[PDB]
Each structure stands twice: as structure tokens, then as C-alpha cells.
Design an enzyme around this catalytic site. Structure first.
Site, PDB file in Angstrom:
ATOM      1  N   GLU A  37     -14.464  96.017 -41.051  1.00  0.00           N
ATOM      2  CA  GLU A  37     -13.473  94.949 -41.030  1.00  0.00           C
ATOM      3  C   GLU A  37     -14.178  93.607 -41.144  1.00  0.00           C
ATOM      4  OE1 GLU A  37     -10.181  94.417 -41.135  1.00  0.00           O
ATOM      5  OE2 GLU A  37     -10.748  92.298 -41.085  1.00  0.00           O
ATOM      6  N   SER A  97      -4.644  88.029 -43.879  1.00  0.00           N
ATOM      7  CA  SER A  97      -5.132  88.105 -42.508  1.00  0.00           C
ATOM      8  C   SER A  97      -6.501  88.770 -42.494  1.00  0.00           C
ATOM      9  CB  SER A  97      -4.158  88.869 -41.610  1.00  0.00           C
ATOM     10  OG  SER A  97      -2.964  88.130 -41.409  1.00  0.00           O
ATOM     11  N   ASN A  99      -8.888  90.032 -39.697  1.00  0.00           N
ATOM     12  CA  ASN A  99      -9.079  90.377 -38.295  1.00  0.00           C
ATOM     13  C   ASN A  99      -8.912  91.882 -38.162  1.00  0.00           C
ATOM     14  OD1 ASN A  99      -5.980  89.437 -38.526  1.00  0.00           O
ATOM     15  ND2 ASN A  99      -6.163  91.073 -36.995  1.00  0.00           N
ATOM     16  N   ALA A 110       9.062  95.788 -38.366  1.00  0.00           N
ATOM     17  CA  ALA A 110      10.292  96.306 -38.952  1.00  0.00           C
ATOM     18  C   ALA A 110       9.927  97.393 -39.956  1.00  0.00           C
ATOM     19  CB  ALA A 110      11.095  95.194 -39.622  1.00  0.00           C
ATOM     20  N   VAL A 207     -17.111  94.120 -46.826  1.00  0.00           N
ATOM     21  CA  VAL A 207     -17.440  95.071 -47.879  1.00  0.00           C
ATOM     22  C   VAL A 207     -17.393  94.329 -49.208  1.00  0.00           C
ATOM     23  CG1 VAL A 207     -16.869  97.255 -48.968  1.00  0.00           C
ATOM     24  CG2 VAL A 207     -16.466  96.938 -46.516  1.00  0.00           C
ATOM     25  N   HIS A 388       4.985  90.705 -48.587  1.00  0.00           N
ATOM     26  CA  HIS A 388       5.248  92.071 -49.039  1.00  0.00           C
ATOM     27  C   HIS A 388       4.900  92.153 -50.524  1.00  0.00           C
ATOM     28  CE1 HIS A 388       8.439  92.370 -45.580  1.00  0.00           C
ATOM     29  NE2 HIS A 388       7.199  92.434 -45.131  1.00  0.00           N
ATOM     30  N   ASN A 422       0.352  98.106 -49.352  1.00  0.00           N
ATOM     31  CA  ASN A 422       1.611  97.909 -50.057  1.00  0.00           C
ATOM     32  C   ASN A 422       1.416  97.912 -51.567  1.00  0.00           C
ATOM     33  OD1 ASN A 422       2.583  97.464 -47.399  1.00  0.00           O
ATOM     34  ND2 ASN A 422       2.136  95.271 -47.588  1.00  0.00           N
ATOM     35  N   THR A 434       5.585  98.273 -45.048  1.00  0.00           N
ATOM     36  CA  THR A 434       4.467  98.794 -44.262  1.00  0.00           C
ATOM     37  C   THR A 434       4.677 100.254 -43.881  1.00  0.00           C
ATOM     38  OG1 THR A 434       3.928  96.594 -43.400  1.00  0.00           O
ATOM     39  CG2 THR A 434       3.106  98.494 -42.172  1.00  0.00           C
TER      40      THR A 434
END
Ligand SMILES: Cc1cc2nc3c(=O)[nH]c(=O)nc-3n(C[C@H](O)[C@H](O)[C@H](O)COP(=O)(O)OP(=O)(O)OC[C@H]3O[C@@H](n4cnc5c(N)ncnc54)[C@H](O)[C@@H]3O)c2cc1C
Ligand SMILES: O=c1c2cc(O)c(O)cc2oc2cc(O)c([C@@H]3O[C@H](CO)[C@@H](O)[C@H](O)[C@H]3O)c(O)c12
Length: 457
Positions: A37, A97, A99, A110, A207, A388, A422, A434
């Protein structure tokens, strides 16, 4: 810092990559797994939702630490350039994001079900994988049975939506991944992954390249962000579950450049609206249909947006897929991580504006069913606000040049290389992706877990 060789090398730590670590830790307990990560660990357990941090200062620290190295919401960061071009709309608010846990550390959990043309037709076990994704995310539909206004909003919406609709497409409680506490990647990994002695999570590990030996996946080139040293971890299988944008970036930087890589990118056009109840003193689901290609979610707002009785309406449109909606990378220009810089080519066709207009009219219709509309005109969010993004590494039945991976999410040109997220979803979807993306990850992880357990090597 990193082991010289593992069985599976997982890029990214979001819910989809964690699903690969989950099924592998369940179905292939002897396989050594290395998850890298680029972002830091901002929650306990690694990948938990930031709302588990009760301290707002500590929670803001976890959010701001995830915003990487026109504003982005807490826990995400936007691009600095290459998000728009003359003649096209682009995605000016395409966020990311960085993290442990990915966007699942900041999302709202959702997890609706796809219906109609949203459902991937060439996957016979789709419902099976969707129920499995419910198990990994901890999805529940009865998280607000004791809420006073959830049932009222739901029945007042049903009075205008449920006409002529079959039960699967009527107003119903939004399936939520709740663990009070929203479920993050810590739930997807779970005790099976954390207690797996052959799995290890490396945070702050960028990576930079996917290794390929003799056509098949060979490993990953991981830069230790703590020290700056670049390692090379060998692997029989490589799973790249970075995000919808950096996943085709990593493959592009690795020389894995098929024609469909990044193309057919589709964002979910989002409309917002607010309304007030009518009584004195949860999240609802308006499902997608083919003739009404919108995904609605209604929920309570803490206060009125304009100067729990107040509800916020959000409709998400399905995109008219276009191949010229390509994600382009420039090898000469590098981003803040040293990877090729992104060029986003996104333009709404006439069909897109036709559906977007219908979404504004329908969300106003939905706002009148709940009560008195708080707003006056429904607002359209800039492209990329839904977070999305699909199709960038989409799956297909064959390698006709329109898909990047197999139905098992295995890249055609690179055996042993799998892509997650996605971007794997190839269909024109409007619901929150998701859950479906995790379901596709379970099939891909089971393709690896069966090939490992059945191999002689
Ligand atoms: C505020 C908010 C609300 C949301 N609400 C919903 C919702 O209600 N429903 C829904 O379905 N979705 C929602 N989402 C979106 C959802 O969180 C994401 O779609 C989901 O995280 C996708 O999973 P993923 O693992 O493919 O992506 P990610 O979680 O983004 O996985 C990518 C990960 O890989 C890492 N990575 C990237 N590049 C590299 C690299 N080169 N090397 C190593 N690691 C790398 C990233 O740092 C990140 O951790 C929301 C998002 C936000 C921000
Ligand atoms: O951030 C929050 C949030 C923060 C709080 O502190 C809190 O108490 C409640 C919160 O509820 C939210 C509810 C939401 O629907 C959204 C979302 O808009 C996105 C694009 O704009 C879409 O990706 C998501 O599909 C949609 O779900 C949110 O972003 C949030």
C-alpha cells in the site's frame, strides 16, 4: 524490508484487493501473500473506517494523511492537471485515496445490487458472488429498524416509485456495510487475513512496475517510501487493485498496454436535491431500471444545506459507454509518485445529457414525494464527484480489443496478472459499484486459489 519472493503480490489495500487477500486467506491458506500500500496506515485495525476514531482531531489527522503527498472531500485528493481538455468535459473532481483501506476508509458503505443491464450477463454465478461480497463487507439491510423517519421516508417514496415495479426494484432499505460503525477494508480482510501467518501488509510501499517473465506475471517493483530504495518482489500471481485510475497507470508503466486499457471509462453522473418532512416533534434505495437508468439513495442530513426531518436525495446516472472515453498516460510527464501522468478524456454525449435531464426531473419528483422540497432546483455535480469510475480495466468474454481482463478478472496479455476495482465493471451501471467490484474480486481470487491449490509447483 520486503520478502524476496511470494506466491501472490497484491497492489493496493482497498476493499477489492482486500477481497483477494480474504479469499486467498480462506481458500488457499498455504499461499504467501504480500500486500503493498502506497499510503500509510491511518486506522486500527489497518484499513478500518476513519469514523471508528471518535476523536475528530485524530480522525481529521487520519483523513488528511490519506490525501496523498475545486476541492476534494476529506480523505481524498484530486488531480493537479490532465483532468479536462478543450472539446471534452473531463473529470475536474476525479479524486483518489492513498492510505491503508483505500476509499473504503472514507466511504459511506452503500452496497446496492445491480439490476437489468447493469448486471454482467456472462457471469452465471453473479448472485452467488454478490452474496459473498455481502459476507465480506458485512452488508445488512436492517441497520435502521429503530429509526423514526426511515420507514416514513421509505413508504412516501414507495407511493410514487413502486407503481408497476417488481419487488426487486421497489423502494427498500439501502443495503449497508455496517460493522454504528461503517465497514472498511478491515472488515473485508477480517480475522482470516490478519491471523493468516503467510500474509503481510506493507504500508507506505509504492508499486512502480509489474514484473513479467516469459509472458506470465513475475512480480512487482516496490519502492520503499520510508527509505526510497526500490525492491523487486517475485510472485507467481500479481493482483493490481489500486483504483480505477492508478491501476491502468501501473500496467501502462509496466509496458502492459492493450488497446482497451483505460478506455470505456465511465463516471456515474450524480444529481443532488433536498426535501423536508411533514411530521412534528437510515438510507433508502430507489433502484435502477433500464427505462429509468438512475440510482437513487435518500438519507437523513444532520442539518439543512441551505438557510433528522431533512433528507438528502442523490440520483446516479448510467453512462453511455464510449470508447473515446480513454484514460491516457504520458511517459514523459510524471505525477507526484514518479508514475506516468494521467490525461482524462471524458465527454458526455447527447444521450448522457438526455438521461441527466431525466435524473433532475425524477429527483424533483422524488423530492415532492418525501415532502416540501428544501432546495428549488436540483444541482448536478461535476464529473467525477461520484467517485464511481468503471471500465478502465473492464472484463469481457473474449480479447476482441474492447476488454482488458477475462471474466475471472485475469488480464488477457499477461497470464497470472489480475486487476481489481470498479474499473473491471464493463457494463453501464448506475448503482454504487464497490459491492459488485468486490464480487468480481471473489471470482478472481477463487480463480487464483483454485490454480494454487491444484498446481504441482
Ligand atoms: C466519501 C466517499 C463516499 C463513498 N461512498 C460510497 C458508497 O456509498 N458506495 C460505494 O459503492 N462506494 C462508495 N465510495 C467509493 C468506494 O470507497 C470505492 O469505490 C472503493 O474503495 C473501491 O475499491 P478499490 O479497492 O477498487 O479502490 P481503492 O480503495 O481506492 O483501492 C486503491 C488502493 O490502492 C492504493 N494504490 C494506488 N496506487 C498504488 C500503487 N502504485 N502501489 C501501491 N498501492 C497503490 C491506493 O492508495 C488505495 O489504497 C465512496 C467514496 C468516498 C470517497
Ligand atoms: O462524506 C460523507 C459523510 C461524512 C460525514 O461526516 C457524515 O456524518 C455523513 C456522510 O455521508 C455521506 C453520504 C454520502 O452519500 C456521500 C456520497 O457522495 C459521493 C460523491 O459526492 C458518492 O460517492 C457516494 O456514493 C455518496 O454516497 C458522502 O460523500 C458522505
Amino acid at each position: 524490508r520486503y520478502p524476496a519472493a511470494v506466491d501472490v503480490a497484491i497492489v493496493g489495500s482497498g476493499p477489492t484487493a482486500s477481497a483477494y487477500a480474504r479469499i486467498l486467506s480462506e481458500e488457499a491458506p498455504g499461499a504467501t501473500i504480500a500486500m503493498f500500500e502506497v499510503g500509510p496506515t491511518v486506522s486500527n485495525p489497518p484499513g478500518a473506517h476513519v469514523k471508528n476514531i471518535e476523536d475528530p482531531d485524530s480522525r481529521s489527522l487520519a483523513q488528511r494523511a490519506s490525501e496523498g503527498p475545486r476541492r476534494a472531500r476529506p480523505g481524498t485528493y484530486l488531480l493537479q492537471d490532465g483532468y479536462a481538455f478543450p472539446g471534452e468535459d473531463g473529470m475536474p473532481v476525479a479524486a483518489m485515496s492513498s492510505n491503508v483501506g483505500g476509499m473504503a476508509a472514507h466511504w459511506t458503505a452503500a452496497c446496492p445490487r445491480p439490476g437489468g443491464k447493469e448486471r454482467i450477463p456472462f457471469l452465471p454465478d453473479l448472485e452467488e458472488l454478490l452474496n459473498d461480497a455481502d459476507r465480506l463487507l458485512g452488508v445488512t439491510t436492517h441497520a435502521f429498524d429503530g429509526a423514526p423517519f426511515s420507514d416514513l421516508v421509505r413508504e412516501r417514496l414507495a407511493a410514487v416509485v413502486d407503481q408497476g415495479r417488481t419487488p426487486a426494484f421497489r423502494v427498500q432499505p439501502m443495503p449497508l456495510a455496517v460493522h454504528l460503525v461503517w465497514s472498511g477494508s478491515d472488515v473485508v480482510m477480517g480475522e482470516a487475513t490478519r491471523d493468516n501467518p503467510q500474509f503481510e501488509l506493507f504500508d507506505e510501499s509504492l508499486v512502480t512496475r509489474v514484473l513479467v517473465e516469459d509472458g506470465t506475471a513475475a512480480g512487482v517493483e516496490v519502492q520503499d517510501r520510508r527509505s526510497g530504495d526500490t525492491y523487486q518482489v517475485a510472485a507467481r500471481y500479481v493482483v493490481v487493485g489500486a483504483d480505477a485510475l492508478r491501476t491502468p497507470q501501473l500496467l501502462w508503466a509496466s509496458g502492459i498496454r492493450p488497446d482497451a486499457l483505460g478506455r470505456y471509462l465511465n463516471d456515474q453522473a450524480q444529481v443532488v436535491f433536498a426535501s423536508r418532512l411533514r411530521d412534528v416533534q437510515g438510507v433508502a434505495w430507489v433502484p435502477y431500471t433500464d427505462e429509468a437508468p438512475f440510482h437513487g439513495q435518500i438519507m437523513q442530513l444532520d442539518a439543512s444545506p441551505v438557510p433528522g426531518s431533512i433528507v438528502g436525495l442523490g440520483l446516479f446516472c448510467a453512462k453511455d459507454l464510449q470508447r473515446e472515453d480513454r484514460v491516457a498516460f504520458d511517459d514523459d510527464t510524471r505525477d507526484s509518485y514518479g508514475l506516468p501522468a494521467m490525461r482524462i478524456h471524458y465527454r458526455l454525449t447527447e444521450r448522457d445529457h438526455v438521461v441527466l435531464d431525466r435524473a433532475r426531473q425524477e429527483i424533483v419528483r422524488l423530492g415532492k414525494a418525501v415532502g416540501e422540497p428544501l432546495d428549488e432546483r436540483p444541482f448536478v455535480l461535476p464529473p467525477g464527484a461520484s467517485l464511481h469510475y468503471q471500465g478502465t480495466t473492464r472484463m469481457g468474454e473474449t480479447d476482441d480489443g474492447e476488454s482488458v481482463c477475462s471474466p475471472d478478472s485475469q488480464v488477457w496479455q499477461v497470464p497470472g496478472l489480475f486487476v481489481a476495482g470498479n474499473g473491471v465493471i464493463p457494463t453501464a451501471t448506475a448503482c454504487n459499484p464497490t459491492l459488485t467490484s468486490v464480487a468480481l474480486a471473489v471470482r478472481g481470487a477463487r480463480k487464483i486459489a483454485e490454480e494454487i491449490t491444484s498446481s504441482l509447483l
